[PDB]
Amino acid sequence: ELSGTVTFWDTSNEAEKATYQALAEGFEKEHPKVDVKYVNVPFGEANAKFKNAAGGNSGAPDVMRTEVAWVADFASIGYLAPLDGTPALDDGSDHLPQAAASTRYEGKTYAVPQVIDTLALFYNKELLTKAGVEVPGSVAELKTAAAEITEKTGATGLYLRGDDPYWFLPYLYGEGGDLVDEKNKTVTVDDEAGVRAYRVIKDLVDSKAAITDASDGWNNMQNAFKSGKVAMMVNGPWAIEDVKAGARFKDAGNLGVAPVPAGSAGQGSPQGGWNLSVYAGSKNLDASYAFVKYMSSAKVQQQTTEKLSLLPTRTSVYEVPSVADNEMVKFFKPAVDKAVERPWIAEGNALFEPIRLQMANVLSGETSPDEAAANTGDAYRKLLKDYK
Ligand SMILES: OC[C@H]1O[C@@H](O[C@H]2[C@H](O)[C@@H](O)[C@@H](O[C@H]3[C@H](O)[C@@H](O)[C@@H](O[C@H]4[C@H](O)[C@@H](O)[C@@H](O)O[C@@H]4CO)O[C@@H]3CO)O[C@@H]2CO)[C@H](O)[C@H](O)[C@@H]1O
């Protein structure tokens, strides 16, 4: 028997949330004595809100949509129920290895994978065609393309997200860099690749190839792309249905997607995504395990793709013709296969704030690329006491 309340905190965005609420409530079809209480929690607030609730054992959710870096974060402070040997885990081996890695902390499973993602270059096909340019493969090509776009159409080439540090990573990887060398416990962000990456973002804006904003970056990016103010943006699968709501991208026929541009050394995009965790203090652990199994099942992952084009973590789901033949999936899955995995460490989540501050200050001209890289390195060494 399953009965009682399962409160689910979902972080999905305005375009995704109706789908996720319907899926969550569908758990009640097979378990009518369970009451699913769906709550949508803003992404930026959710980590803090969960810690506040879990630390005061006061209004915590039973099931938490848990960003890949939040698993080790929450788990290290005891907020997550261990899932090994529980009904929450079913056909575990189906999940992509890199998705499974993010669910683990100190030899225990604290989450089940839900979606996997990476960043890509979205582009407005009509604008590029009008400008007579090809989708750019590199930053150098992007600069050239942007000039032609402005000359021939008046649009700016790129919206460069300046207020979210995750958007720094493609530039860092393209310059031949990474945050840390996990295996050797060495901070690497302040290597010359870090300097180069901060210089690249500043040059893109100064040269007018790109525009940016120091605040409200999600809305500003989406607005600029949807309104044709820019021809390109870097974004993820969570943006697809949001973009398609716009007059300019109905049915996605005008929406192109390609890999993030290479830099001077090579090319790369980060691995991200979401898992599902159970609050350690839940008063309905059984019903929660079953809710997690349900939300992470092949059936529900397939539905999510069909409604939202989010990428399944289950390998088996990619063999479903409906998923295999989805064009956003056909592009994003290979890109995900190549995505750079991060260290799944308690402090991994905290690696982002230092980038955020230095990136803002580079873009405004308050901080040189050289100082920004050094500052980011210093911040990491403070965070990671056993890293050189
Ligand atoms: O570490 C967590 C805290 O720090 C910052 O989070 C990071 C995060 O660890 C990174 O992996 C990356 O998160 C991205 C995520 O993986 C993507 O899926 C995407 O998230 C969107 C969801 O897909 C969508 O459903 C809805 O929830 O909106 C999300 C946001 O658009 O994009 C994420 C990046 O925006 O990057 C962030 C750094 O921003 C962050 O500071 C938080 O406060 C975390 O607590």
Question: Which domains does the chain possess?
Answer: 1-118+270-343 (3.40.190.10), 119-269+344-388 (3.40.190.10)
344 CB less than 6 Å from ligand 1?
no
Helix (H) or strand (E) holding 154: none
Q: Produce one character per residue of 99-130: b if its CB has 16 or more CB atoms within 10 Å, e if not.
A: bbbbbbbeeebbbbbbbbbbbbbbbbebbbee
Strand partners, 210: 158
Helix (H) or strand (E) holding 129: helix 125-131
Beta bridge partners of 274: 67, 115
The closest-lying atom of ligand 1 relative to the alpha carbon of residue 69 is: 9
Question: For this experimental structure, what is the resolution in angstroms?
Answer: 1.5
Ligand 1 pocket member 38 (CB < 6 A): no
What sign results for the dihedral spanned by CA atoms 310, 343, 119, 71? positive
The one-letter amino acid code at 224 reads A
Q: Is 236 in the pocket of ligand 1 (CB under 6 A)?
A: yes
Q: How far is the CA of 340 from the centre of ligand 1 (A)?
A: 15
Using CA positions, which residue lies closest to atom 2 of ligand 1?
349
Question: How far is the centre of ligand 1, averaged over its atoms, from the C-alpha of 162 (Å)?
Answer: 14
Residue 12 CA, ligand 1 centroid: distance in Å = 10
- Residue of 234, 232, 198 whose CA lies nearest to 360: 198
Structure tokens at 276: 């599902």
Q: How was this structure determined?
A: X-ray
Instruction: Please identify, by atom number, the ligand 1 atom nearest to the C-alpha of residue 12.
Output: 25
Residue with tokens 């652990």: 285
DSSP letter at 315 equals G
Tell me the β-bridge partners of 113: 275
Q: Which of 67, 74, 313, 340 to mutate to test the pocket of ligand 1 (most atoms within 8 A of CB)?
A: 67
Q: Which of 17, 43, 308, 351 gets mutated to test ligand 1 (max ligand atoms within 8 A of its CB)? A: 43
Ligand 1 atom closest to residue 218's alpha carbon, by position in its atom list: 31
Contact 190, 376 (CB under 8 A): yes
The protein residue with its alpha carbon nearest to ligand 1, atom 36, reads: 166
Q: Which residue is it, tokens 């100082």?
A: 371
Taking the CA atoms of 199, 204, 208 and 212 in sequence, report the sign of the dihedral they define.
negative
User: What's the CA gap between 383 and 362, in Å, rounded?
Assistant: 22
Phi, psi (rounded to 5 degrees) for 94:
-65, -30
Rounded to an integer, what distance in angstroms lies between the CA atom of residue 133 and that of residue 145?
A: 6
Residue 115 CA: nearest ligand 1 atom is 18
Residue of 209, 179, 163, 184 whose CA lies nearest to 270:
179
